Write a protein that binds this ligand. Structure first.
Ligand SMILES: [Mg+2]
Lengths: 304, 5
């Protein structure tokens, strides 16, 4: 990624401005709920405006920062990709179940993850990536030993370092892992993305066994799904109480959100607290709430 | 989001 100057941030602002205008089309019927692209892009502009204001007179420091160069490169690519999506999708952007519309929804999630990462690394406009707090002690020790105080590393470097502690059994498994951990879809792993993954799939001691049981082989897990998509996907199971799915919370990154059909005709979503996802799923099955993952009659046996 | 069932 090349050096980021003030002109490059202004070019991204223009591209984001085009995406905002595309997403103001009333044919989209865009719901004002996270992730909401019409909030995320102006909020990203404002945080970049904040970053630039903290680096007045020291723009050479900001331009050389590796994380910020990777971030701006990804921001330009993602906005260009959204513009191309509208250009090629044409009228299919407004059909609610179309693939081009689903691609826009996934991109909206990516913009939300990117803003969350940017605020985690530049909390008040100043770079603090070297002192980021990985929330699980064992995961923090892994990153420190493998990468010191780095904020971002290429996927290849990350896979190699992880494999030495948690062996990855195959190339296909490594691609599934990458797709899970790389929330910003930039082929890099930030310390912020690593924290999120290791909080979601704790304990560290059995990290990849947990991820395999909760995501790789579990029909209830939904990658890159939003609150509104979970409610929509459960509608077909409104008469099948106990149908449930789960996914990453968008607004509380690092925590799980479980959606389920109640016995009284409601579709509710909850964020487990003070217990790991596996125990929430086990207790929920025993108590009758989480019986049918994605509406399927067989539920995985996690008591093992 | 609502409390856990
Ligand atoms: Mg990434």
């Amino acid at each position: 990624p090349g050096t980021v100057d003030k002109k490059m941030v202004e070019k991204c602002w223009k591209l984001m401005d085009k995406v905002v205008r595309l997403c103001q089309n009333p044919k989209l019927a865009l719901k004002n709920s996270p992730p909401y692209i019409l909030d995320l892009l102006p909020d990203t502009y404002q945080h970049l405006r904040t970053i630039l204001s903290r680096y007045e007179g020291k723009m050479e420091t900001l331009g050389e920062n590796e994380y910020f160069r990777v971030f701006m490169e990804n921001l330009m690519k993602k906005t260009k990709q959204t513009i191309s999506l509208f250009k090629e999708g044409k009228e299919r952007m407004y059909e609610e179940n179309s693939q081009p519309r689903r691609n826009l929804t996934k991109l909206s999630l990516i913009f939300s993850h990117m803003l969350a990462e940017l605020k985690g690394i530049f909390p008040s406009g100043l770079f603090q990536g070297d002192t980021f707090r990985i929330t699980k002690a064992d995961a923090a020790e892994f990153w420190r030993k493998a990468f010191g105080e780095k904020t971002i590393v290429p996927w290849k470097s990350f896979r190699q370092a992880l494999h030495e502690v948690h062996p990855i059994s195959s190339g296909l498994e490594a691609m599934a892992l990458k797709s899970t951990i790389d929330l910003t879809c930039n082929d890099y792993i930030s310390v912020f993305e690593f924290d999120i993954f290791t909080r979601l799939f704790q304990p560290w001691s059995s990290l990849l066994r947990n991820w395999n049981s909760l995501a790789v082989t579990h029909p209830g897990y939904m990658a890159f799904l939003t609150y509104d998509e979970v409610k929509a996907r459960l509608q077909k199971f409104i008469h099948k109480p106990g149908s449930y799915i789960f996914r990453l919370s968008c607004t509380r990154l690092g925590q799980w959100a479980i959606g389920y059909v109640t016995a009284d005709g409601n579709i509710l979503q909850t964020i487990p607290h003070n217990k790991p996802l596996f125990q929430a799923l086990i207790d929920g099955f025993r108590e009758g709430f989480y019986l049918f993952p994605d509406g399927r009659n067989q539920n995985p046996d996690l008591t093992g | 989001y609502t409390p856990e069932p």
